[PDB]
């Protein structure tokens, strides 16, 4: 059955239990941004450090 | 500290852009000025360079930690720099630096031990030692028996209780000065002997003498000096394997 | 490591059925009958007990 | 005396050779750990054939 | 709330911009610098 | 296919199953610091600055 309107779904859905795993790559670790940050000293190019 | 409107009173720096900000105004006086991280050729010390390899060979032959060695390296460097004692054998100075560092770490090793790892006579090491004390103008510390209770008893694989009993026996003996004029080790070994003789882990004086390096008669003499108080010198927390009355005489 | 207190899908309380489950398998019951004697009739609530590995009993072997 | 050789864990020359699970847990070791690696400066190194 | 865009002040957007500069680095739709004509770059995080 | 948010290798997942412990985990991390005497005067020490 549809969850928003309670109507039946014309097709029949294939459902069953399976075994999933959670990989190591999470999103809290891959987001980063720079906007006028620290720069180097000799060549004055943007630096992270 | 400065600003065009006022002489600055305080200039904080920021982890963000990396710059110097001035809170009485917010003005970024500095602008990303701060960095946010806040052989054959050798002639000099060809012999000094080799001496520290030889320090590293000799110092850790007994497996002394690197922190001790690093100051030994720093000590020599200092002794080298003054060069007042420059006209002397390097290996003696290295060995003397080594004796000092152990004392500086509060864990001296006997010259006898230091001799084991070097060719230098105890006399020349002592001589050089004095010169370094005078050279570097620094004081030293007196020896304690307990500092050698650990490894010797270890070398005999004696249990801590015997080891600790010996230490008290030694400690009580020195507080009472039962053995005036004597080196700490000879007195300690006899205490260890007495202790070992107060446990099942008895050993012959010659074996102990062999481990400490002292003469078997010197222990025998030192024993004669501590024997009058053998019973009372023991710690209150002890379990005899042999009555003090049954303690042997020599 | 320890039995969850609620089935992830229904929400039915499971965390109080682990000792009774071991007690029924203790005597002679098959896993199919022990799960019926407890009242677990949806196959989402039977997966909870049927596929649980109890690691807490092996971390109690290390002295505190 | 000559020198010191590293020791592969769970060998015949390790301190864990032939122990029972009641003693492996008493030294804070895992009875399921396979062994076969060296401990060199804290790290755990493994040799590739 | 980290990347910025420098917006010149004109009598068409003076009120909106001073409203934005009232709230700085704490509310999200804010601002974090003022660059006056002299080149003076003041920081809103430290201004009392 | 439910609402288009699982197209091209994605998954829709139940929010009120995540609230009952589904695929929850923890994350540890260690840091080292070592006090050192690099020189005869330059010396480090742990203290409250
Ligand atoms: Zn200012
Ligand atoms: Zn359920």
Structural class of chain B: mainly alpha
Helical coverage of chain C, percent range: 25-40%
Question: What is the CATH top level name of the largest domain in chain B?
Answer: Mainly Alpha
Sum up the overall morphology of chain B in one term: elongated
| CATH level 3 topology of the largest domain in chain B | Cyclin A, domain 1
Q: Please outline the major beta sheet of chain C.
A: none
Keywords:
part of a larger assembly, 6 chains, B: about 250 residues, mainly alpha, Cyclin A, domain 1, 11 helices, elongated, E: about 50 residues, alpha+beta, two-stranded antiparallel sheet, binds zinc ion
Question: What would you note in describing this structure?
Answer:
This is part of a larger assembly, with 3 copies of chain A (49 residues), 1 copy of chain B (250 residues), 1 copy of chain C (64 residues) and 1 copy of chain E (48 residues). Chain A has no helices and no strands. Chain A is low in regular secondary structure and 49 residues long. Chain A is elongated, with a radius of gyration of 25 Å. By secondary structure, chain C is an all-alpha fold. Chain C contains 3 helices and no strands. The radius of gyration of chain C is 13 Å and the shape is globular. By secondary structure, chain E is an alpha+beta fold. Helix content of chain E is 19%, strand content 12%. Chain E has one helix at 14-22, and strands at 33-35, 41-43. The chains are: A little secondary structure (49), B mainly alpha (250), C mainly alpha (64), E alpha+beta (48). The interface between B and E is small, with 12 and 10 residues. One zinc ion is lined by residues 7, 9-10, 12, 42, 44-45 of chain C. Chain F: It comes from Sus scrofa. Chain F: This is DNA-directed RNA polymerase subunit beta. Chain F: It is found in: Nucleus. Chain F: Belongs to the RNA polymerase beta chain family.
Quickly describe the structure.
Chain A is low in regular secondary structure and 49 residues long. Chain A is 0% helix and 0% strand. Classes of the chains: A little secondary structure (49), B mainly alpha (250), C mainly alpha (64), E alpha+beta (48).
Topology:
This is part of a larger assembly, with 3 copies of chain A (49 residues), 1 copy of chain B (250 residues), 1 copy of chain C (64 residues) and 1 copy of chain E (48 residues).
Chain B: E1 12-14, E2 19-21, H1 46-59, H2 66-82, H3 90-104, H4 111-116, H5 122-136, H6 146-155, H7 160-175, H8 184-197, H9 205-212, H10 216-226, H11 230-233
Antiparallel strand pairs in B: 1-2
Chain C: H1 18-27, H2 31-34, H3 43-50
Chain E: H1 14-22, E1 33-35, E2 41-43
Antiparallel strand pairs in E: 1-2
Bound molecules: zinc ion (2 copies).
PDB class: transcription
Keywords: tfiid, preinitiation complex, core promoter, transcription initiation, transcription
Entry title: p53-bound TFIID-based holo PIC on HDM2 promoter
């Amino acid at each position: 059955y549809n969850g928003f309107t309670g109507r039946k779904i014309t097709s029949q859905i294939f459902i069953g239990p399976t075994y999933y795993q959670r990989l190591k790559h999470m999103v809290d670790d891959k987001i980063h941004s720079r906007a006028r940050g620290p720069i180097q000293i000799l060549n004055r190019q943007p630096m992270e450090g | 500290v400065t600003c065009p409107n006022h002489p600055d009173a305080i200039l904080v720096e920021d982890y963000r852009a990396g710059d110097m900000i001035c809170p009485e105004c917010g003005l970024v006086v500095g602008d990303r000025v701060i960095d946010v991280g806040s052989r054959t050729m050798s002639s000099s010390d060809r012999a000094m360079m080799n001496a520290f390899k030889e320090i590293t060979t000799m110092a850790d032959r007994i497996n002394l930690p690197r922190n001790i060695v690093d100051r030994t390296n720093n000590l020599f460097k200092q002794v080298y720099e003054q060069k007042s004692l420059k006209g002397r054998a390097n290996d003696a100075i290295a060995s003397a630096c080594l004796y000092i560092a152990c004392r500086q770490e509060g864990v001296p090793r006997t010259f006898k031990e230091i001799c084991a790892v070097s060719r230098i006579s105890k006399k020349e090491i002592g001589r050089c030692f004095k010169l370094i004390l005078k050279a570097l103008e620094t004081s030293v510390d007196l020896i304690t028996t307990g500092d050698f209770m650990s490894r010797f008893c270890s070398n005999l694989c004696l249990p801590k209780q015997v080891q600790m009993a010996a230490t008290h026996i030694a400690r009580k003996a020195v507080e009472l000065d039962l053995v005036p004029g004597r080196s700490p080790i000879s007195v300690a070994a006899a205490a260890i002997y007495m202790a070992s003789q107060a446990s099942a882990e008895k050993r012959t004086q010659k074996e102990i003498g062999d481990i400490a390096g002292v003469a078997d008669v010197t222990i025998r003499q030192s024993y004669r000096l501590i024997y009058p108080r053998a019973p009372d010198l023991f710690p209150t927390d002890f379990k005899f394997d042999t009555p003090v009355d049954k303690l042997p005489q020599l | 490591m320890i039995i969850p207190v609620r089935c992830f899908t229904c929400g039915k309380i499971v965390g109080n059925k682990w000792e009774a489950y071991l007690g029924l398998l203790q005597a002679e019951y098959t896993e199919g009958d022990a799960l019926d004697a407890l009242g677990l009739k949806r196959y989402c609530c039977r997966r909870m007990l049927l596929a649980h590995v109890d690691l807490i009993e092996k971390l109690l072997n290390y002295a505190p | 005396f000559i020198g010191k050789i590293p020791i592969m864990l769970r060998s015949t020359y390790c301190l864990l050779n032939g122990l029972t699970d009641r003693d492996l847990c008493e030294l804070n070791e895992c009875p399921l750990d396979p062994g076969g690696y060296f401990i060199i400066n804290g790290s755990e190194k493994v040799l590739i054939a | 709330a980290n990347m910025t865009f420098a917006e010149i002040v004109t009598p068409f957007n003076i009120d909106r911009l001073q409203e934005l500069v009232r709230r700085g680095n704490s509310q999200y739709p804010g601002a974090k610098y003022i660059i006056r004509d002299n080149g003076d770059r003041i920081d809103l995080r430290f201004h009392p | 296919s439910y609402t288009g948010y699982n197209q091209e290798d994605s998954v829709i997942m139940n929010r009120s199953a995540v609230d009952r412990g589904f695929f929850r985990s923890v994350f540890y991390r260690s840091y080292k610091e070592q006090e050192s005497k690099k020189g005869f005067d330059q010396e480090e020490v742990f203290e409250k600055p």
